[PDB]
Design a protein around this motif. Structure first.
Motif: not given
Ligand SMILES: CCN(c1nc(NC2=CCC3=CNN(CCCO)C3=C2)ncc1F)c1cccc2[nH]ncc12
Length: 265
Positions: A15-30, A78-89
């Motif tokens: 399928g696809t991989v999208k960037k998102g923003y998830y509203q935590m108890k106080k801050v929003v997490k990328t 399946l929602v993960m914390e974003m590692a912004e710079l992406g794949p090492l290769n």
């Protein structure tokens, strides 16, 4: 299980991989989200990401991507914390002036996450540069636990029934020949990952078929030293590529060899 109302997905895929923003108890997490189709669904894909989430739920280390959770909505996510710079290769393909010290730092971080995984008695089974994600140019995390396995209490290996569809160019000989996967098998993959990182994200065993790689390795032949790769790092790759699983180092031994400070064994 996550609340779809608290999740915002960007349209432009990563399928696809999208960037998102998830509203935590106080801050929003990328976040970075793997999305599966609900209608034309593949049950084996759904099972793999459910298995992946089950593994992630049991892991807690600074060098392993953290799972936020699963969201069941217009699609399965399946929602993960974003590692912004992406794949090492890909990063190293686009940034050819990253210094040796910096590449050593990044692969040392991977070895620290893998030393934890080894301690935790999980095998990764897809340890390649594409699956190392960068938080920053100085902070790497291990991702993609889709093929990972929790080892039985009485064995140091996971036995696959036969050969599946695998990343064979990253697999140790005992994986290819006997379908046995241990933390030592991940050390071999880590040697290939090191080669990738010092070859600025080039693919290993360029132009060769999986069968040709197996024959090359059985003959005691190995990939050559990447241009400009520190000699000490190439030596560590060759130790990772020890044919005999019993004489190959584990991650405790490999992690020591990537430290940039004096230490005792
Ligand atoms: C690799 C996709 N990804 C992540 N991705 C990222 N960051 C990325 C940032 C930028 C980028 C560009 N390309 N890709 C890879 C896309 C997948 O092919 C990128 C990934 N951070 C954390 C992530 F967890 C994932 C999300 C959900 C479940 C997952 N399992 N294994 C990886 C993964």
């Amino acid at each position: 299980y996550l609340d779809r109302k608290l999740l915002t997905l960007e349209d432009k895929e990563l399928g696809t991989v999208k960037k998102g923003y998830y509203q935590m108890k106080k801050v929003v997490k990328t976040v970075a989200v793997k999305i599966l189709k609900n209608e034309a669904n593949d049950p084996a894909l759904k099972d793999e990401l459910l298995a992946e989430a089950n593994v992630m739920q049991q892991l807690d280390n600074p060098y392993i991507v953290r799972m936020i959770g699963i969201c069941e909505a217009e699609s399965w996510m399946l929602v993960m914390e974003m590692a912004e710079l992406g794949p090492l290769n890909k990063y190293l393909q686009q940034n050819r002036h990253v210094k040796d010290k910096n590449i050593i730092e990044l692969v040392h971080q991977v070895s620290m996450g893998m030393k934890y995984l080894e301690e935790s008695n999980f095998v990764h089974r897809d340890l390649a540069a594409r699956n190392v994600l960068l938080v920053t140019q100085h902070y790497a995390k291990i991702s993609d636990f889709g093929l990972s396995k929790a080892l039985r209490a009485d064995e140091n290996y996971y036995k696959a029934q036969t050969h599946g569809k695998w990343p064979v160019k990253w697999y140790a000989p005992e994986c290819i020949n006997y379908y046995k996967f241990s933390s030592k098998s991940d050390v071999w993959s880590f040697g290939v990952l090191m080669w990738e990182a010092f070859s600025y994200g080039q693919k290993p065993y360029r132009g060769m078929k999986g069968s040709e790689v197996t024959a090359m390795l059985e003959k005691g032949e190995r990939m050559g030293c990447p241009a400009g790769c520190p000699r000490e790092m190439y030596d560590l790759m060759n130790l990772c590529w020890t044919y005999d699983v019993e004489n190959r180092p584990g991650f405790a031994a490999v992690e020591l060899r990537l430290r940039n400070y004096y230490y005792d064994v």
